From a paper:
Cystinuria is caused by mutations in system b0,+, which is a Na+-independent cystine/dibasic amino acid exchanger localized at brush border cells in the kidney and intestine. Mutations of the regulatory glycoprotein [name] and the amino acid transporter b0,+AT, which constitute system b0,+, are linked to type I and non-type I cystinuria respectively and they exhibit distinct phenotypes due to protein trafficking defects or catalytic inactivation. Here, using electron cryo-microscopy and biochemistry, we discover that Ca2+ mediates higher-order assembly of system b0,+. Ca2+ stabilizes the interface between two [name] molecules, leading to super-dimerization of b0,+AT–[name], which in turn facilitates N-glycan maturation and protein trafficking.
To further improve the map quality, we performed the multi-body refinement and focused refinement, improving the map resolution to 2.6 Å for the extracellular domain and 3.0 Å for the individual heterodimer. The ectodomain displays a glucosidase-like fold, which consists of domains A, B, and C. The domain B is unique to [name] (not present in CD98hc) and composed of two insertion loops within domain A. For simplicity, we refer to the first loop as domain B-I (residues 213–289) and the second loop as domain B-II (residues 318–355). Domain B-II interacts with the adjacent [name] molecule and thereby contributes to the formation of higher-order assemblies. The interaction involves six salt bridges, one π-cation-π stacking and several hydrophobic interactions, which together give rise to the strong higher-order assembly. The cryo-EM map of [name] revealed a strong spherical density in the middle of domain B. This density is surrounded by the acidic side chains of Asn214′, Asp284′ and Glu321′ and the main chain carbonyl groups of Tyr318′ and Leu319′, indicative of a metal cation. In [name], the Ca2+ ion bridges domains B-I and B-II to reinforce the super-dimer interface. Electrostatic potential calculations of [name] with or without Ca2+ showed that Ca2+ neutralizes the super-dimer interface to facilitate the homomeric interaction.
Numbering used by the authors:
A (entry chain A), B (entry chain A): 111 to 685
Amino acid sequence: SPKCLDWWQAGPMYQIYPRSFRDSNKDGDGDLKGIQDKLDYITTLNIKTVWITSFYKSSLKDFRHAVEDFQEIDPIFGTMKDFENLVAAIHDKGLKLIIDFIPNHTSDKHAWFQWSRNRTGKYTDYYIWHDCNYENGTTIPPNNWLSVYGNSSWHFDEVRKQCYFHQFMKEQPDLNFRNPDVQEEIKEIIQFWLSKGVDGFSFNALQYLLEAKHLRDEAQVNKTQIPDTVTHYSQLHHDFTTTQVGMHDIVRSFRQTMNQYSREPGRYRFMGTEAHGESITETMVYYGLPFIQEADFPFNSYLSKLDKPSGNSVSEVITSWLENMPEGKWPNWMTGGPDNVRLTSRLGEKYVNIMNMLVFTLPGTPITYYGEEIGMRNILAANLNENYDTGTLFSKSPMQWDNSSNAGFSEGNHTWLPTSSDYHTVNVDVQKTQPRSALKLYQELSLLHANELLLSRGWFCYLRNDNHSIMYTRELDGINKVFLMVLNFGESSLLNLKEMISNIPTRVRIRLSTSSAYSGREVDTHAVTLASGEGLILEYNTGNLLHRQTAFKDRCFVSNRACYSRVLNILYSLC
Amino acid sequence: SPKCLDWWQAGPMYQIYPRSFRDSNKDGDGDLKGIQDKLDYITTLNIKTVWITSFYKSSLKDFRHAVEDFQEIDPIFGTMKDFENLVAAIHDKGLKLIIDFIPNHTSDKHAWFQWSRNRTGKYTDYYIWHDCNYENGTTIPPNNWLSVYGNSSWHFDEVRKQCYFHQFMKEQPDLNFRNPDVQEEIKEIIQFWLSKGVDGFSFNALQYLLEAKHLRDEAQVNKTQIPDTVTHYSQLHHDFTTTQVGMHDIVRSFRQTMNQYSREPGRYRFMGTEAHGESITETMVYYGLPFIQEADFPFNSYLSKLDKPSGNSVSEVITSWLENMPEGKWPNWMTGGPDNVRLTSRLGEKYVNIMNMLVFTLPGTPITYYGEEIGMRNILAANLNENYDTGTLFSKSPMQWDNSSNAGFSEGNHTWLPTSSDYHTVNVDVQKTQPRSALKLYQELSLLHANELLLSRGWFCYLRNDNHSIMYTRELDGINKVFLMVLNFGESSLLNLKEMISNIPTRVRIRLSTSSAYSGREVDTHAVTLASGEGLILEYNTGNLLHRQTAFKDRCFVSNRACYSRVLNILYSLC
Ligand SMILES: *[C@@H]1O[C@H](CO)[C@@H](O[C@@H]2O[C@H](CO)[C@@H](O)[C@H](O)[C@H]2NC(C)=O)[C@H](O)[C@H]1NC(C)=O
Ligand SMILES: *[C@@H]1O[C@H](CO)[C@@H](O[C@@H]2O[C@H](CO)[C@@H](O)[C@H](O)[C@H]2NC(C)=O)[C@H](O)[C@H]1NC(C)=O
Ligand SMILES: *[C@@H]1O[C@H](CO)[C@@H](O[C@@H]2O[C@H](CO)[C@@H](O)[C@H](O)[C@H]2NC(C)=O)[C@H](O)[C@H]1NC(C)=O
Ligand SMILES: *[C@@H]1O[C@H](CO)[C@@H](O[C@@H]2O[C@H](CO)[C@@H](O)[C@H](O)[C@H]2NC(C)=O)[C@H](O)[C@H]1NC(C)=O
Ligand SMILES: *[C@@H]1O[C@H](CO)[C@@H](O)[C@H](O)[C@H]1NC(C)=O
Ligand SMILES: *[C@@H]1O[C@H](CO)[C@@H](O)[C@H](O)[C@H]1NC(C)=O
Ligand SMILES: *[C@@H]1O[C@H](CO)[C@@H](O)[C@H](O)[C@H]1NC(C)=O
Ligand SMILES: *[C@@H]1O[C@H](CO)[C@@H](O)[C@H](O)[C@H]1NC(C)=O
Ligand SMILES: *[C@@H]1O[C@H](CO)[C@@H](O)[C@H](O)[C@H]1NC(C)=O
Ligand SMILES: *[C@@H]1O[C@H](CO)[C@@H](O)[C@H](O)[C@H]1NC(C)=O
Ligand SMILES: *[C@@H]1O[C@H](CO)[C@@H](O)[C@H](O)[C@H]1NC(C)=O
Ligand SMILES: *[C@@H]1O[C@H](CO)[C@@H](O)[C@H](O)[C@H]1NC(C)=O
Ligand SMILES: [Ca+2]
Ligand SMILES: [Ca+2]
């Protein structure tokens, strides 16, 4: 008898950017009270977890953040009581809530830093201070290290008369995780939010926690370049400021703090991490070891990087994640996020449905960014008098609920960001009346994913794939039924499935289709037609399963194998 | 009720260089059968653990080693049966046996390497192979990395037509610990020796297990130096070939393999490591974490580095180890070893006794190198027709047992190394007849250390120290007795102890003294005389202990605090 799937394994996650979900008090900024009013809509999506990005008291709301108090709410989002009412409303709905945590830096207005730049007490080495020659407005940094946004990562502080370190903007001084006073502070921040009932954290920017103690220069990517023109982050090799040797042991103490709150059954606290962008073998380290426990999964954002809808492009993201993942770990598929271009603008409107069908039929936890379920798109321009990253700001446009003032988001006259011009046709109210929309298909896949027992605990055998088409099967032993997903990223195709499967009848029934005209229509596997961005979930009966054979041992995947008993009507792991 | 001390915590360790202990078959090389004949002498020293350095089948017996078979014995030392008879003899004596393990490299005659240089099967990537331009006997290495003994660490292999990596000599190709086939091989070597009854391992050269995958050049210590004259290891910064990010996780899997054999009580398997030479904060990482288990202790060889007998020199080694050590860990004190100059030649013959008294009264496990108990010294010259390191060879001279042929070591005409000329006066037989010798005092400290309950579980308060004198106290709460160790590394001293302690009577009795004339003589703490290399263990009665006060909270140390009950007659941890 195998162990039940945890709540973070069983249902999709829904990532919300709280300043753009729903506005309650007519001021143009979303708030925690507005998320509580729309909890009913989240349960129609069969969502399991709500993931709210940062809402702490912040002096900078971008550039990975500048938090002035890790135990407070920013005023625009509400108060501490408004958050406690939201958590009670989320739990009584049967949902879970995970929140963003960034432990790397603070704001230069944090009380810890105003005490540190004065050498007040034990706060003197909460940050990384160093002597640097400064005069006439010019400073000589202790080394050639560059900030992620590009300039010397050392900044002179006139009060302390030294230089402090920052990986990000100068408003974001880096905390010193080599001393144990700072790790006790972060330990107390975790315990404060886990006490309020938060079901887990998403830790971001963990690869920047530690830097080399010797403070030696980095090696330039171009060896023969004049050292005074090195100002771009991509012009250096980052061997001393990223993923130092003691970094994963700090992450493991975060996990051990969260184990104190995850003992009682039903209240396991989730831990997730932002993946290393340029390396997938460094990402799989966060999965932990057979004897050392770490993150529950690192968030896989490699599907949200693709800017060309190709068959070989998607196929490569899938196999590379499942090949490198440790043996019995849980995959996850994130097709969009706050800092990448929305799916409709990146790939095209004809690919919205095919992409919802992909992440819901792959093995693991599908993670959904708000607006992706209705085919939302990037806004073309904005006018913001606040410090934001204009390269990534346009995917945070307010949610489109109906055809009304500000797409039914604010009920005021102004919103912090403009809504898309096509909210008259693309909105939640309109899409849930028409029979086959982007929102309707999402609700059919979310419901299918919930109660199938074949998509949640079934094997995954990835069949061959020419470009422009992806095929794979989900199957469990004692079920006598398999799902066959055919996804066509090409211009068209009329392909023969009897050649490819060799385990398929001549008449199979269509369980679901993105075009949605094939409601329950049967098809003949001799000649199946796929119209350039269409996907089918075929369902039929068979005994000879694909993973039993020796030809497919290499391309079948399962997290924890468990056969099914038609007699006893239970999963059992002995098989 | 606190947990009992393990066998590696309770008694001293005795390090034996097996080729120089005792020769059985007249061939001039010590063997495992010769160690079994002298087990009686090891129990007169009250030794708990025997530590035998490497004896595997080796093509190179120095330069950290070149092993041709990790599951065989070198012929000069005996056979597999001779080892099984030695382990049975060691256990039936009540002793433990730990052995050396080096997992970094092999010999170029290993079967794994003769299969790897031919690309035979899965052995093709057991080692680190790379393409390099070779012609006319000259080779262009893949980067500027240097071997520890100084030259390019890449060597061209004519059969494979590539370059292989070696941190040490070219006869020692480095294993590839990034693939899992090699870590399964080392896992099976550990299980093979733990099955034979070996009670633990000493892992050496663990900081060299991993190297950077990118193979980028190191940074020169002298930035403006011509790159073709960089041939010394000390001319580079070793950021890519030493202590890479995944190294401690490989050590932790070694520990987890040894936990399968350490479950039954009385048979815990010890794990020790060779310390990082130039850094003490990197050494304390091997102690592990509160939640991740690693080495039981890293071997502290900082006492064996001192080449000047100074009071401030010894005092600095002691405080730096106890300050940086994690909270409840076990210290260890190694005053000599196979690769450093013996204690008599490094400091002087007048400092042999004072150094035995130091490591036996400090808190932790004292580790003894064979010959140190009788005041052995380095030989002046040798004539070896084998590849050895002449800089460190002279501390491996054969053990001096009596005034006979070859100091009673071989019973043959030749020995692999000559014995010291002064074996007529310095030998075990002579020293155990005269009343107060180096061997006699060692047996009194070893016996005192065994059954005292104050030196094994007592606090350690390090009192003030002018140069030329070291004072410290060992005390437990419910015992009503304290030991006061006065060690004089200066030229002479007549010091007043009533000024320094303020808890001491005017008449205290001498428990032990290196000069040994003070057998049971009482002394007056008004004027105590110490003759330039003398040490006293003073013993008296008091109630107001030194660690109870607030002035000494900073300079008292204990591994696991536990008071003593005069009524119940047990240690209890609630105090
Ligand atoms: C580093 O910081 C400076 C701070 O001013 C940035 O400034 C640019 O400076 C050049 C001339 O020195 C101007 O032509 C640019 O207009 C400045 N930038 C802006 C946005 O006004 C500089 O860009 C930074 N280096 C980076 C980001 O690589
Ligand atoms: C690395 O940088 C050097 C110098 O910046 C580049 O070499 C050329 O140097 C001359 C100097 O007189 C410049 O006029 C050229 O513009 C430089 N070339 C380029 C492409 O910038 C060298 O090419 C750089 N290496 C690269 C770009 O790989
Ligand atoms: C690197 O390896 C070479 C291999 O020969 C070592 O050789 C020395 O070479 C110089 C001239 O090239 C001779 O004068 C020396 O006598 C050679 N050494 C010996 C021991 O004979 C060289 O020393 C090595 N580099 C080191 C060890 O730093
Ligand atoms: C680093 O190396 C350079 C060059 O090897 C040293 O600079 C001097 O360079 C001239 C070149 O004409 C030599 O004649 C001198 O002998 C070099 N000086 C020395 C001390 O070797 C530079 O000094 C070195 N840096 C050090 C040793 O810190
Ligand atoms: C700055 O320093 C002064 C004196 O050094 C101190 O009185 C003041 O409280 C400090 N400011 C802060 C914000 O700690
Ligand atoms: C003052 O600033 C100028 C900038 O042109 C600089 O060259 C000079 O060294 C500075 N001198 C002092 C004393 O700060
Ligand atoms: C949507 O809103 C517009 C303006 O508010 C209105 O004219 C239109 O009738 C609405 N749509 C429907 C279906 O009622
Ligand atoms: C919003 O602004 C409009 C004019 O811009 C004004 O007529 C209206 O009263 C405002 N609404 C609120 C709630 O203040
Ligand atoms: C060397 O290679 C040949 C053929 O490639 C093979 O027959 C031989 O066994 C190899 N030698 C060793 C020691 O494996
Ligand atoms: C041969 O060796 C000489 C060494 O003087 C070298 O200069 C030359 O490049 C080499 N040529 C070939 C073809 O190996
Ligand atoms: C030690 O050995 C020498 C030579 O074997 C011998 O002359 C001497 O008497 C021995 N010492 C004692 C105390 O017997
Ligand atoms: C040792 O060598 C000597 C001469 O060097 C010889 O007389 C003696 O017999 C040898 N001993 C043995 C055991 O071979
Ligand atoms: Ca940092
Ligand atoms: Ca290695």
